[PDB]
């Protein structure tokens, strides 16, 4: 009944060009079985959205990766927020929701905006730059670690740690085994910068530890909640901003519309989030025998969600392969959906908006003038280098 496919969604050939295989996964049926890793797969928008909004049946406490926490021990202590189910997930979620609240973005927006308005000017003085290293990475690194309240020493560990966390959700391929092999130095620093004495007052991490008084989390739970933002608060914004620049580089008509109306910058970033989906996949584990798409999945089965394929499903989106800064992006699962929907989506949209805003007001053209190289990861889509030449407006 369920179609079986040998497609490896975690191979380098799949990362180079996932779109042909993602249509094969979508059109093969609402639910597929991937013989390479013995998992169920959903690639259409409807099933991916239904799985995300059914946390009781498709839980996350047994791991959002391939590995079953009930069968294998996790490579690191489980996330109190990402790898937990209600009700144990609720209160750590509420703390991170208030630390990254709408009232919090007001205190950092101008600093977020001025730094974006300072980087575009710096890169315009150089002309030919790398949109990944000198923009997609340089801008969030100049903004997010300080907003977290981080020290300056050892800051070159976060991006290797962030890339390793996303790589560990994948199967035991080389990408995962090579990552975890180079882990202990990155883990030691990250865990070190989760303790209360190492967080600057007023930063995100200090606010998390302040939320131990409220009784929603204990002091022993705050370092893990700080570790969640150190694992997820940087590299997805890097790939998200690096996606918008690439999309504006190959869709020059969309760049010119953004120039004429800079207020489209926020939705232009939301469109780049749907179009590229910096988080490609995430797992769930069936807590019961469940029927989905005419397929009866047993208990304790890993179900793979293709968030990028769901953001390009023609059953839900018109012209899903086109970058449209005026598209009604509401409903896309680039940030997830349900009780686990990205708690730091306001921080990511703030960084993406003010950067596309600075580009909309100061850049006239973005021309790719160098070899474009992709960055391979089991969970994250993103470019290693994007050599572009910026024309000042």
Ligand X SMILES: CSc1ccc(C(=O)O)cc1
- Footprint of ligand X on this chain (CB under 6 A)? 79, 81-82, 165-166, 227-228, 231-232, 279, 379
Closer CB to ligand X, 33 or 335, in the complex: 335
Of the candidates 260, 337, 275, 351, the one whose C-alpha atom is nearest the C-alpha of residue 309 is 275
Has 89 been labeled as part of a binding site? yes
Evaluate whether 304 touches 9 at the Cβ level (below 8 Å): yes
The residues with which 365 forms a beta bridge, in sequence order, are 391
195-254 positions binding ligand HEM, by CB under 6 A: 228-229, 232-233, 236-237, 240
- Of these partners, ligand X, ligand HEM, none, which one is at the site of residue 223 (CB under 5 to 8 Å by kind)? none
Closer CB to ligand HEM, 302 or 340, in the complex: 340
User: What minimum distance in Å lies between the beta carbon of 81 and ligand HEM?
Assistant: 5
Dihedral of CA atoms 293, 39, 173, 240 in degrees, nearest 10, equals 30
- Of these partners, ligand HEM, ligand X, none, which one is at the site of residue 237 (CB under 5 to 8 Å by kind)? ligand HEM
Evaluate whether 34 touches 289 at the Cβ level (below 8 Å): no
- Of these partners, ligand HEM, ligand X, none, which one is at the site of residue 340 (CB under 5 to 8 Å by kind)? ligand HEM
User: What minimum distance in Å lies between the beta carbon of 207 and ligand HEM?
Assistant: 12
User: What minimum distance in Å lies between the beta carbon of 284 and ligand HEM?
Assistant: 8
Site mask, ligand HEM, residues 368-387, x = CB under 6 A? Answer: --------------------
Evaluate whether 244 touches 272 at the Cβ level (below 8 Å): yes
User: What minimum distance in Å lies between the beta carbon of 259 and ligand HEM?
Assistant: 23
User: What minimum distance in Å lies between the beta carbon of 125 and ligand HEM?
Assistant: 27
Of the candidates 274, 282, 272, the one whose C-alpha atom is nearest the C-alpha of residue 243 is 272
Has 4 been labeled as part of a binding site? no
Closer CB to ligand X, 203 or 336, in the complex: 336
50-79 positions binding ligand HEM, by CB under 6 A: 60, 64
User: What minimum distance in Å lies between the beta carbon of 146 and ligand X?
Assistant: 20
- Of these partners, ligand X, ligand HEM, none, which one is at the site of residue 385 (CB under 5 to 8 Å by kind)? none
Measured CA to CA, the distance from residue 232 to residue 228 in angstroms comes to 6
332-361 positions binding ligand HEM, by CB under 6 A: 334-336, 340, 342-344, 347-348
Copy the structure tokens of residue 201: 């007052």
- The radius of gyration of the chain's CA atoms, rounded to the nearest angstrom, is 20
Interface residues toward ligand HEM, by CB under 6 A: 60, 64, 81-82, 93, 96, 100, 228-229, 232-233, 236-237, 240, 273, 278-279, 282, 307, 334-336, 340, 342-344, 347-348
Which residues make up each annotated binding site for heme b? 89, 93, 284, 340, 342
């Amino acid at each position: 009944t369920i179609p079986h496919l040998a497609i490896d969604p975690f191979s380098l050939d799949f990362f180079d060009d996932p779109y042909p295989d993602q249509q094969t996964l979508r059109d093969a049926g609402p639910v597929v079985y991937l013989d390479k890793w013995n998992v169920y797969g959903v690639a259409r928008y409807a099933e991916v959205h239904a799985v995300l909004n059914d946390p009781t049946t498709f839980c996350s406490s047994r791991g959002v990766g391939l590995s079953d926490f009930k069968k294998e021990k996790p490579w690191r202590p489980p996330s109190l927020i990402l790898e937990a189910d209600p009700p144990a997930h609720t209160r750590p979620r509420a703390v991170l929701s208030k630390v990254l609240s709408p009232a919090t973005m007001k205190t950092i927006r101008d600093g977020f905006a001025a730094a974006a308005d300072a980087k575009v000017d710096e890169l315009l003085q150089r002309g030919c730059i790398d949109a990944i290293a000198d923009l997609a990475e340089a801008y969030p690194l100049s903004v997010f670690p300080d907003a977290m309240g981080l020290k300056q020493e050892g800051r070159e560990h976060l991006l290797p740690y962030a890339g390793l966390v996303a790589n560990a959700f994948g199967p035991p391929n080389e990408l995962r085994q090579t990552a975890i092999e180079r882990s202990a130095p990155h883990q030691a620093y990250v865990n070190e910068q989760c303790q209360r004495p190492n967080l600057a007052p007023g930063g995100f991490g200090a606010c998390i530890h302040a939320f131990t008084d409220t009784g929603e989390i204990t002091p022993d739970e705050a370092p893990l909640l700080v570790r969640s933002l150190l694992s997820a608060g940087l590299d997805t914004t890097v790939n998200g901003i690096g996606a918008a620049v690439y999309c504006l580089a190959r869709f020059p008509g969309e760049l010119q519309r953004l120039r004429s109306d800079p207020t489209l910058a926020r939705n232009a970033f939301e469109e780049a989030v749907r179009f590229e989906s910096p988080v490609q996949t995430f797992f769930r584990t069936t807590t019961r025998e469940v029927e989905l798409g005419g397929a009866v999945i047993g208990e304790g089965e890993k179900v793979l969600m293709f968030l990028g394929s769901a953001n390009r499903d023609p059953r839900r989106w018109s012209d899903p392969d086109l970058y449209d800064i005026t598209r009604k992006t509401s409903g896309h699962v680039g940030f997830g959906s349900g009780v686990h929907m990205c708690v730091g989506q306001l921080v990511a949209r703030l960084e993406g908006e003010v950067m596309l805003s600075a580009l909309a007001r100061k850049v006239a053209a973005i021309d790719i003038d160098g070899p474009v190289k992709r960055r391979f990861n089991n969970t994250l889509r993103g470019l290693e280098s994007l050599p572009v030449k910026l024309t000042p407006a």
